[PDB]
Amino acid sequence: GFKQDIATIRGDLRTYAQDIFLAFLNKYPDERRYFKNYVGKSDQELKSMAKFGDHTEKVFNLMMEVADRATDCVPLASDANTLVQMKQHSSLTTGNFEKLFVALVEYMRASGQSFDSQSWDRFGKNLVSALSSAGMK
Ligand code: HEM
Numbered sequence: 001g002f003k004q005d006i007a008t009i010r011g012d013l014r015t016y017a018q019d020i021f022l023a024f025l026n027k028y029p030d031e032r033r034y035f036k037n038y039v040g041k042s043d044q045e046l047k048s049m050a051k052f053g054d055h056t057e058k059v060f061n062l063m064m065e066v067a068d069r070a071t072d073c074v075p076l077a078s079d080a081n082t083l084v085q086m087k088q089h090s091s092l093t094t095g096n097f098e099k100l101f102v103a104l105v106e107y108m109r110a111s112g113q114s115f116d117s118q119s120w121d122r123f124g125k126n127l128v129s130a131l132s133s134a135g136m137k
Contacts, residue, residue, distance in 0.1 A: 001116050001119065002067070002073060002116045002119040002120070002123070003068075004116075005108075005115050005116055005119070005120070006064050006067050006068050008113070008115075009060065009064055010064055013057055013060055013061060013064070014053050014056070014057045016060065017053075017056040017057045017059065017060035017061075018046070018047060018052070018053060018056050019107065020060070020103065020104050020107050021056045021059070021060075022043050022046065023103045023104075023106070023107045024099065024100050024103035024104070025038070026043075027099075027102075027103050027106070028099045028103065031096065031099060034091070034092075034096070037051075038052065062082075062083075065079075066079040066083075066127070067123060070123060070126075073119050073122045073123040073126055074126050075123070075126060075127050075130050077130060077133075077134070079130075080127065080130035080131050080133065080134045081134045083127075083131060083134075084131055084134040084135055084136045085134075089136075092136065093136065093137050094128045094131050094132050094136050094137070097124070097127065097128055097131060098124070098128055100124075101120070101121070101123075101124025101125075101127070101128070102124075104120055104124070105117050105120050105121045105124065108120060
């Protein structure tokens with residue numbers, strides 16, 4: 001289930017974080033514009049670079065904190081607020097997050113592992129609703 005998936009992801013956080021983030025950028029290439037220092041780099045280039053790994057791991061760490069604090073895939077209002085009020089997220093709309101979660105769910109569906117992809121789809125939908133509520137356009 002969802003709790004197990006959090007454990008799975010945390011167990012190899014840097015690998016999943018990189019793989020899912022790359023799946024996101026490659027499926028939605030226009031999104032790479034928010035990441036000016038990743039423009040013009042292959043997947044293996046980016047994997048070579050500690051800063052790419054560091055960024056992505058920090059993102060997914062927080063994502064797993066928010067997921068673990070959720071009840072039945074419903075995130076806390078407070079966690080939504082953190083994500084909306086972070087300086088780094090000042091130019092984002094809910095669609096940016098929507099894209100990330102579609103990529104994550106598609107990754108899970110493609111993985112051949114028994115991820116609870118339906119729960120991640122719901123968690124993403126709930127988080128998007130909560131960001132919108134916290135003031136995100
Ligand atoms: C649940 C989803 C997300 C979480 C948990 C999250 C979390 C974070 C965290 C923790 C940082 C700071 C990382 C660091 O210090 O290295 C960060 C930075 C950032 N995030 Fe997000 N993020 C999310 C979604 C997104 C999406 C969808 C976008 C854009 C499509 C985005 C764009 C950025 C950018 C541009 C930065 C700054 C890049 C940098 O200077 O390192 N985030 N995010």
